[PDB]
Amino acid sequence: SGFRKMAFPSGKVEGCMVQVTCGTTTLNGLWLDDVVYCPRHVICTSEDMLNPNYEDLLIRKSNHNFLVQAGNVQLRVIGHSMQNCVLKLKVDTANPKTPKYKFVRIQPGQTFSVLACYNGSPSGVYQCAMRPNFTIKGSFLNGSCGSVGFNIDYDCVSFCYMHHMELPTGVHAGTDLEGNFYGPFVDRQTAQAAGTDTTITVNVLAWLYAAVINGDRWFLNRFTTTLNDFNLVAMKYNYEPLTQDHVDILGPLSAQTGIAVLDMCASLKELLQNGMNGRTILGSALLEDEFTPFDVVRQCSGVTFQ
Amino acid sequence: SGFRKMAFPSGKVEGCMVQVTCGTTTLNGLWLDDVVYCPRHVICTSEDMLNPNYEDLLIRKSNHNFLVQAGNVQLRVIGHSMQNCVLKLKVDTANPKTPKYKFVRIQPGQTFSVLACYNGSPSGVYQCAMRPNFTIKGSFLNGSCGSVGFNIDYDCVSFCYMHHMELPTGVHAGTDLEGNFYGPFVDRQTAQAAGTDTTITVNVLAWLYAAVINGDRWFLNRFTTTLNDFNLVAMKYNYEPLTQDHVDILGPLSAQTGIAVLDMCASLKELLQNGMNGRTILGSALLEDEFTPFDVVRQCSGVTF
Ligand SMILES: CC[C@H]1CN(c2cncc3ccccc23)C(=O)[C@@]12CN(S(=O)(=O)CC1(C#N)CC1)Cc1ccc(Cl)cc12
Ligand SMILES: CC[C@H]1CN(c2cncc3ccccc23)C(=O)[C@@]12CN(S(=O)(=O)CC1(C#N)CC1)Cc1ccc(Cl)cc12
Ligand SMILES: [Cl-]
């Protein structure tokens, strides 16, 4: 029993974190095999960030201008290249701790673990979600760029995020491991702001199913709804539209609890209208949206507390 | 910016988890040097759990009755002993991944990371606190016994909890690594319940400081209070009494924000008496009490391991 915001064990990723230095800038890098991946903005000054010409800044750099430190060992850079917004530094040593891995680009609503790092040293691990506005609500200080997000379904690490920037509202932006930003963001200090964010409806429904599995049903009601009427109501509370894909994805949680997806949608419509009236759901007074259907199945018992 | 429930990196602990089997029971063990630590209830059957005589059950066991598996390797047990509610299995191989470590017993209000494990394989990591009633609000299913809680200081892992049991209210109970239970619990299938819990006041104050550091200031006010008047309010809302030690501990946060501890106590008093009025603090509609003053300082400073 119980339900917590649970991150994947970070050991496989800790063994890949290194420090990358270029001039007076130091940030984190991810060392997989003989390549170190890091944000290309490591080659910029503060002044460069207004209108950086990355190709022009990079052509003036040699391999020996990049210092890579893994623990207390200095790695030798033997090649460099830029791929989108990521710098790839070829090193003379393959990481002996390289786990089995993949690079995966995720969609809004998907969750992942973040291993926050400073100076190539891991400091903490936490769970987060890619928001519908393509930002993440992380916890990152200056020096955390290059920290990565990942999932570890089975013994394979799927890297999905590399940290690049903090927006004026205190939320965060970054790229996949091929250097493509999530969202319309750029690694340039422009007028960039997070777009209006919305609640991840499919995740709130998954978390309501988690509460039922854990033994709570106070929020259920005798009503159902059509998908269209549910969406008309949801959008009035800044909730994302629920699609037929989301209904299909909720199928196994619907079967384990005996509550049809549209029946759970009617419960969510009522909670949006009434609030909780002094009650909590899984120890929260707000409707939680950073647990996916997959996360609930991963954590919860396969047996409902009826 | 940002404030999350953050756990310590779990790698040093992952390298210590093993599976321990005795008969038809399988649970997790902690392998440090040549000893594997696990709950002594691994030697019990379902019927034995009803009223176990652990010394009598243990004397009938040989070393070869314990199967220890580390990854895909079978470790050979060469000795066994009991220390309080923990079984110590001496093995023929020292763990090559043993980190620098200590066994520490924590006090209520202190937080730690839990590495949830099943069949000797780590599944997830989360943060929690030792409640004033000595239970933890964990997330554990059957097979999680032997999972451990810990903190890290530089390169040293301080192991503080080993999981043993789930109570009827869905909360959890366990021991330190010397096998002493936190709370008035016993390792037997008998009627046991979590006592009435209280809110960890010093931790709520620490989290209010974290909200100020992050830009949430709406709850601040011009008022102050005495420690005695604050405690008269706190007792009425099932909050733990705030001591001069707690005030001293909040000093490094009181100086970094310019808000005196008793000034923040006056904000907490008004929050208790009036509520949040539709507002949230760090994305929460409840007053969060599972961040210690040290956790706030560490997350707002970037301490590494
Ligand atoms: C090039 C250095 C990075 C570092 N950084 C940060 C990353 N994570 C956490 C941080 C927390 C504190 C301060 C910096 C943080 C960034 O946002 C920087 C620096 N900033 S900044 O200082 O204006 C950012 C900010 C605002 N608004 C003050 C928060 C411009 C910029 C523009 C594009 C990109 Cl891709 C990165 C960056
Ligand atoms: C001997 C097996 C352990 C396993 N366990 C569990 C540990 N964590 C999470 C679990 C979640 C699901 C079921 C078991 C859980 C326990 O609480 C057991 C089994 N239980 S029980 O099944 O009656 C407990 C319960 C209640 N109330 C139904 C939850 C008796 C008992 C008594 C003393 C001790 Cl030290 C341990 C235990
Ligand atoms: Cl995805």
| Residues of A with Cβ-Cβ distance to B3 under 8 angstroms | 139
CA distances to A54, A231, B255 from A247, rounded to whole Å, are 44, 12, 51
Distance CA A302, CA B185 (A): 28
Angle at which helices B261-274 and B201-213 pack, to 10 degrees?
A: 100
- For the CA of A167, the closest atom of ligand 1 is 27
Task: Please give the Cα distance from B82 to B89 (Å, whole number).
Answer: 9
Q: Please check whether residues B20 and B163 belong to one and the same domain.
A: no
Same domain assignment for residues B19 and B44: yes
Residue B125, strand partner residues = A7, B115
CA A172/CA A162 separation, integer angstroms: 11
Nearest to A82 by CA among A102, A64, A59: A59
* Among candidates A6, A14, A116 on the partner chain, residue whose Cβ is nearest the Cβ of B126: A6
Of ligand 2's listed atoms, the one at least distance from the Cα of B167 is 27
Cβ partners under 8 Å of residue A224, min gap 6: A260, A262, A263, A265, A266
Q: How far apart are CA A186 and CA A52, in angstroms?
A: 11
Phi and psi (nearest 5°) for A301? -65, 150
B222 and B87 assigned to the same domain: no
**Catalytic pick among B16, B22, B38, B41:** B41
In a domain, A80, yes or no: yes
Can you give the residue range of the structural domain that contains A112?
A: 1-14+100-197
Q: Is B265 a catalytic residue?
A: no
The method of structure determination was X-ray
Structural domain tally of chain A?
Answer: 3
Going from the Cα of B1 to the center of ligand 1, the distance in angstroms, rounded, reads 10
For residue B279, the SS3 value is coil
Residue whose entry in the numeric block shows the structure tokens 């090193």: A91
Ligand that comes closest to the CA of residue B169: 2
Within 10 angstroms of residue A213's Cβ, the number of other Cβ atoms is: 23
Chain centroid, CA B280 distance in Å: 26
Measured CA to CA, the distance from residue B289 to residue B109 in angstroms comes to: 8
- Work out whether the CA dihedral B206, B212, B215, B217 comes out positive or negative: positive
Q: Chain B residue closest to A171 (CA)?
A: B2
The reply to whether residue B139 touches residue A299, judged by beta carbons under 8 angstroms, is yes
The owner of tokens 């909590």 is A280
Instruction: Answer yes or no: is the C-beta of B144 below 6 A from any ligand 2 atom.
Output: yes
Are B142 and B260 part of one and the same domain? no
Note whether A61 and A138 are same-domain residues: no
Say which of B14, B126, B299 has its CB closest to residue A4: B126
User: Which residues on neighbouring strands pair with residue A47, listed in sequence order?
Assistant: none
Of A99, A119, A142, which closes a domain? A99
Kindly state whether residues B121 and B3 are assigned to the same domain: yes
Which chain B residues contact residue A10 at CB under 8 A?
9-11, 125
Rounded Cα gap, residues B216 and B97, in angstroms: 43
| CATH code of the domain covering residue A256 | 1.10.1840.10
Burial degree of A276 (CB within 10 A; 0-12, 13-18, 19+) = middle
Q: B interface mutation test: which of A13, A126, A137, A300 has the most B CBs within 10 A?
A: A126
The closest-lying atom of ligand 1 relative to the alpha carbon of residue A140 is 9
Using the Cβ of A126 and the Cβ atoms of chain B, whether some distance falls under 8 Å is answered with yes
CB A279 within 8 A of CB A220: no
**Beta strands, E only, A1-83:** 17-22, 25-32, 35-39, 66-70, 73-75, 77-83
> In this structure, what token pair is assigned to residue B221?
């006010």
Task: Compute CA distances B198 → A196, B22, B78, whole Å.
Answer: 38, 38, 45
Scanning every residue of chain A, which has its alpha carbon at the shortest distance from the alpha carbon of B170?
A: A1
Determine the Cα–Cα distance for residues A278 and A29; give it in Å rounded to an integer. 46
Contact A10 B128 (CB under 8 A): no
Q: Which residues contact A255 (CB under 8 A, 6 or more apart)?
A: none
- Tell me what percent of chain B is helix, strand and coil, each rounded to the nearest 5: 25, 30, 45
**B111-118 and B148-153 beta bridge pairing:** antiparallel
Residue whose CA lies nearest to ligand 1 atom number 17: A165
Whole-angstrom Cα distance, residue B26 to residue B67? 9
Interchain pair B299, A140: CB under 8 A: no
Is there a single domain that holds both residue B139 and residue B282? Answer: no
DSSP A265-289: HHHHHHHHHH--TT--BTTBSS---
Residue-by-residue DSSP string for B79-103: EEEEETTEEEEEESS--TTPPEEEE
Q: In this structure, is the dihedral angle defined by the CA atoms of residues B136, B140, B141 and B144, taken in order, positive or negative? A: negative
Q: Is A11 on the interface with B (CB under 8 A)?
A: yes
Round to whole Å and give the CA distance between B8 and B160.
13
Cα–Cα distance, B288 to B109 (Å, whole number) = 12
Residues in chain B within 8 Å Cβ distance of A147? none
CA of A246 to the centre of ligand 1 (A): 34
Q: Are residues A145 and A257 in the same domain?
A: no
Single residue among B38, B67, B99 that ends a domain in this structure: B99
Beta sheet of B17-22, edge-to-edge order:
B73-75, B66-70, B17-22, B25-32, B35-39, B86-91, B77-83
- Nearest chain B residue to A4, by CA: B139
Dihedral of CA B248/B251/B254/B258: which sign?
positive
Residue B174: its H or E element:
strand B172-175
Ligand (nearest to CA of B28):
2
Catalytic annotation present for A163: no
| A6 and A124 fall within a common domain | yes
Beta-bridge partners for B79: B90
How far, in Å, from the CA of A277 to the mean position of ligand 2? 32
Q: How far apart are CA B77 and CA B38, in angstroms?
A: 13
**In-domain check, residue A306:** no
Touching check for B118 and chain A: CB below 8 Å?
no
Does residue B149 sit in the same domain as residue B172? yes
CA distance readout (Å), A168 to A66, A140, A165 = 30, 13, 10
Q: Which of residues 164-203 of A touch B (CB under 8 A)?
A: 166, 170-172
What is chain A's Cα-based Rg?
A: 22
Residue B284: closest CA among B231, B225, B226, B208? B208
Instruction: Show the tokens assigned to A14.
Output: 């800790």
A224 plus A93 within the same structural domain = no
Ligand number, closest to the Cα atom of A160: 3
Please report whether residue A71 resides in a domain.
Answer: yes
Judged by CB atoms closer than 8 Å, whether chains meet at A171 and B2 is answered as yes
Task: Describe the crossing of helices A201-213 and A261-274 by its angle, rounded to 10 degrees.
Answer: 100
Distance from C-alpha of B69 to C-alpha of B63, rounded to nearest angstrom: 14
Beta strands in chain A (DSSP E): 17-22, 25-32, 35-39, 66-70, 73-75, 77-83, 86-91, 100-103, 111-118, 121-129, 148-151, 156-166, 172-175
Closest by CA position to A187, among listed A86, A259, A97: A86
Please say whether the beta carbons of B271 and B225 come within 8 A.
no
Say how many residues make up chain B. 305
CATH at B141: 2.40.10.10
Residue with tokens 């209830």, as numbered in its chain = B41
Last residue of a domain, one of A99, A115, A150: A99
Answer yes or no: do B116 and B49 share one domain. Answer: no
User: How far apart (Å, rounded) are the C-alpha atoms in residues B99 and B151?
Assistant: 13
User: Which tokens in the block code for residue A61?
Assistant: 């750099």
Q: Does A171 fall in a domain?
A: yes
Cβ separation of A126 and B285 shorter than 8 Å?
Answer: no
- Residue A275 C-beta-side C-alpha neighbours within 13 Å: 6
Instruction: Assess if residue A202 is contained within a domain.
Output: yes
Calculate the alpha carbon distances from B39 to B36, B49, B88 in Å: 10, 13, 9
In whole angstroms, give the CA distance from residue B158 to residue B7. 14
